[PDB]
Write a structure and sequence with these properties.
It is classed as transcription/dna/rna. Keywords: Elongation complex, transcription/DNA/RNA, TRANSCRIPTION-DNA-RNA complex. Human RNA Polymerase III de novo transcribing complex 8 (TC8). Chain A is DNA-directed RNA polymerase III subunit RPC5. Organism of A: Homo sapiens. This is part of a larger assembly, with chains A (51 residues), B (46 residues), C (65 residues), D (103 residues) and E (343 residues). In chain A, 47% of the residues lie in helices and 20% in strands. By secondary structure, chain A is an alpha+beta fold. A three-stranded antiparallel sheet of chain A has the order 1-3-2. In chain A, a hairpin with a 3-residue loop joins strand 2 and strand 3. The longest helix of chain A is centred in the middle third of the chain and has 9 residues. Chain A is globular and about 30 Å long. The termini of chain A are far apart. Chain C is mainly alpha-helical and 65 residues long. In chain C, 45% of the residues lie in helices and 0% in strands. Chain C starts with 17 loop residues before the first helix and ends in a 5-residue tail after the last helix. Chain D is of the alpha+beta class and 103 residues long. In chain D, strand 1 and strand 2 form a beta hairpin. Chain D is elongated and about 65 Å long. The N and C termini of chain D lie far apart (50 Å). With 343 residues, chain E is α+β, with helices and mostly antiparallel strands. Chain E has eight helices and 18 strands. In chain E, a hairpin with a 4-residue loop joins strand 15 and strand 16. The radius of gyration of chain E is 28 Å and the shape is flat. The chains are: A alpha+beta (51), B mainly beta (46), C mainly alpha (65), D alpha+beta (103), E alpha+beta (343). At the A-E interface, loops of A face loops of E. Strand 4 of chain B pairs antiparallel with strand 5 of chain E, so a sheet runs across the interface. Bound molecules: zinc ion (2 copies). One zinc ion binds next to helix 3 of chain C.
Chain lengths: 51, 46, 65, 103, 343
Amino acid sequence: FVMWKFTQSRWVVRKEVATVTKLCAEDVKDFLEHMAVVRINKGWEFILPYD
Amino acid sequence: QPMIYICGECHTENEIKSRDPIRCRECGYRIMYKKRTKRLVVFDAR
Amino acid sequence: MIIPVRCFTCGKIVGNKWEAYLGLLQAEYTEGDALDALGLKRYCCRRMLLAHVDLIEKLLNYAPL
Amino acid sequence: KTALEMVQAAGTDRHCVTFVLHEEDHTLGNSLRYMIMKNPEVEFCGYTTTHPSESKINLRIQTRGTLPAVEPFQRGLNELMNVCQHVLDKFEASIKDYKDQKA
Amino acid sequence: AASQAVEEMRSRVVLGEFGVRNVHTTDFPGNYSGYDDAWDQDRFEKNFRVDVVHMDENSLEFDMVGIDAAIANAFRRILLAEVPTMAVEKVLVYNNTSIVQDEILAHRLGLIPIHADPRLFEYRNQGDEEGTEIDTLQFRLQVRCTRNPHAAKDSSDPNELYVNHKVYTRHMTWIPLGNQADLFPEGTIRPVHDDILIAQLRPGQEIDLLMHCVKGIGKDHAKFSPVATASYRLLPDITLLEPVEGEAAEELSRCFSPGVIEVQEVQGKKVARVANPRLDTFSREIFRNEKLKKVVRLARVRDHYIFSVESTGVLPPDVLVSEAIKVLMGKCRRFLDELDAVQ
Ligand SMILES: [Zn+2]
Ligand SMILES: [Zn+2]
């Protein structure tokens, strides 16, 4: 689901993923840290640019 | 008199009498705690 | 273990602002802006909420249940 | 049994008196010290704490002439009471007019 | 001259680079020659005034002019400790299976404020642990955590898996004694914040207890303190010895608080002036600039105290100040009655 959200849009909200997937905060954080970085006022951005 | 205890992993109320090998049903754990008392205890918020 | 209800120095009610703070951590707010939005002007409540470690869930993971 | 008087020595001199006040702290001691220090007939006014464990204070009053040093005590108490009544009335009036002008 | 220095010493408190000067109250008869500092009730009632600048729920700010540091500190200490309120003292526990310790649980429950009006109750006599209708209140807290019968297959979050796993103070139910139900309407006796997290539970664990609350003062224990932060500060009055203009004036706006020093273009050039000295917190950052040290004079007004009182929500802070003044008056009256009984 996280990878699909990243394919649909470059910016992913952590709270939306936590609400949809019904998962705890730490699992969503580990899922995001593997492929995203925290950008202030924008959420989570994919670590690599569009190739 | 029914003496009740709690297992360490199943956490089920087991009634065993005196001089019984400490065990628990549907498992094999051998750690048996005692339930909390029913007497009233007064505490101070200090 | 758990968030204290009263602040050690001043005594402002801080136990009720813990989980909401976690919500501000679940949101995009940082530490400073979240502590400001919670209404903690003096730095004592900021230290109380920031330096607190949530060890209650780690203990409940070892609870009998 | 709360406030007790003590003369300066066995001679029972009314010029130098010590009032021992029970279940008190620095608040009332300092307030009464300020309220009685302005009395022109007081040469020496001073409050102290015997020990932080027990709740008691010792005030000492030494007047200029032949004042019994008990009259300045009552004078300072009445002046502090009047000041408290005045500040209470002023604060109540201020809060009332603030509530009136806010709405 | 000498008169200006005497007036500055007797009216202002100057803050130097290394230390503060003129901090002691000196307006007393015999200390000054050309001043008659003898006590005068008329002059005190004339000069004194109270001006509230901000007043909301559980927060008050008011300036008192004409009072002294002694009476101000007395009011502050009475508000901090000598104002009686209601707080949890006795905890009767019935089968507490929580991970939180019983003593720690009782300590956390004691710190929870109660919205009950303390003036309507009395102090419990020595002993008498049973308590009476007049001088006690009872709060029942019974929370049994269990698994949610309807939840998702995974349910990683504890909210979906379990119910009542976080025992908030809203679960506390006031149990009336005698005729307290008729005297107090429903909803008055309750926890103040209603969102304080007492403990966290797991399925199987249960927290059952009764809380006996009695009247008490903050001096005995900090849990009876009604005010969270009750303090007072001297009103600052920043003065400029020489007119400062140019870009250095902007430095003033960056040296003091952003809201005290304002720059204006009277003739097309920026000149700084004091707009609102109240907002300044006296960070003493002007001493870093070498040139701007001898152009300003930081000072505090001796007979102007801004009181800020943030309470815990038990009662509005104006009533708190009124009750503090009443407690001081009661102490004065008790000592006067004792002195009269002596004589
Ligand atoms: Zn078992
Ligand atoms: Zn604090």
